[model samples]
Target: QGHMIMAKRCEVCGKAPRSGNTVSHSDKKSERWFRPNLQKVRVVLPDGTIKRMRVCTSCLKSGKVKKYVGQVSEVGS
Candidate 1:
């Protein structure tokens, strides 16, 4: 589809992945990559608009980002 530079990156916190051990059943620490816990969510942007983007779990839980729910627009005269 439409893929840019941000293939698997967190837009809000700029979080990516690194290297780590795959696992250890006996004593083998194999090579592996640890990626961020990302999810496609609709966030409330600074422009006061809703948009969907990839964000990390830590950023979401840490309150650095806010999930955009369906909110009623302002109405007055």
Candidate 2:
């Protein structure tokens, strides 16, 4: 099976996993990657196009992008 492996990163800010070390009480350090808080959201493009992208929570909280909003009347009455 040709499975596509998508990278876990933010499309808006290019935020990816950060390498860090975890230290224990015994002073033993273990390497690990800190993943960003990412979420798949519908963003509205400048040309009024909607795109689904993986965006970090920081971008959303900082108002770096606008989410896509569908017309309410389009739903069932």
Candidate 3:
């Protein structure tokens, strides 16, 4: 099979990873790492047409992005 770039956003809410600080249990703040749960999805594009990973389901239901009757693209041909 092949690979493709994933939609840079969250799966549930389309919340992409943002740079920020991490707070430790000792009240110590330092640079940390965090990434959103993003998966490559091929949803119907705007205009109710094509499918691509550029769109995500999170933005669909949350109203963050347009919605359509599309579905996730299957991995591996």
Which of the numbered candidates is closest to the native, going by highest lDDT?
A: 2
lDDT of each: 0.52, 0.55, 0.41
Score candidate 1 by TM-score against the native: 0.46
- C-alpha TM-scores of all predictions: 0.46, 0.47, 0.28
Name the weakest run of 10 consecutive residues (lDDT summed) in model 2.
22-31
What does candidate 3's lDDT look like per residue over 27-51, in tens digits? 2322243224332344555576745
Ranking by TM-score: 2, 1, 3
The number of the candidate with the highest TM-score is 2
Distance from true location, Cα of 10 in model 1, Å: 0.7
What's the lDDT of the predicted structure labeled candidate 1? 0.52
Model 2, position 37, has a per-residue lDDT of 50
> In candidate 2, residue 47 scores what lDDT?
94
lDDT of 1 by residue, 20-39 (tens): 22222332321242234444
Model 2 residue 23 CA deviation in Å:
26
| Residue 1, model 1, lDDT | 58
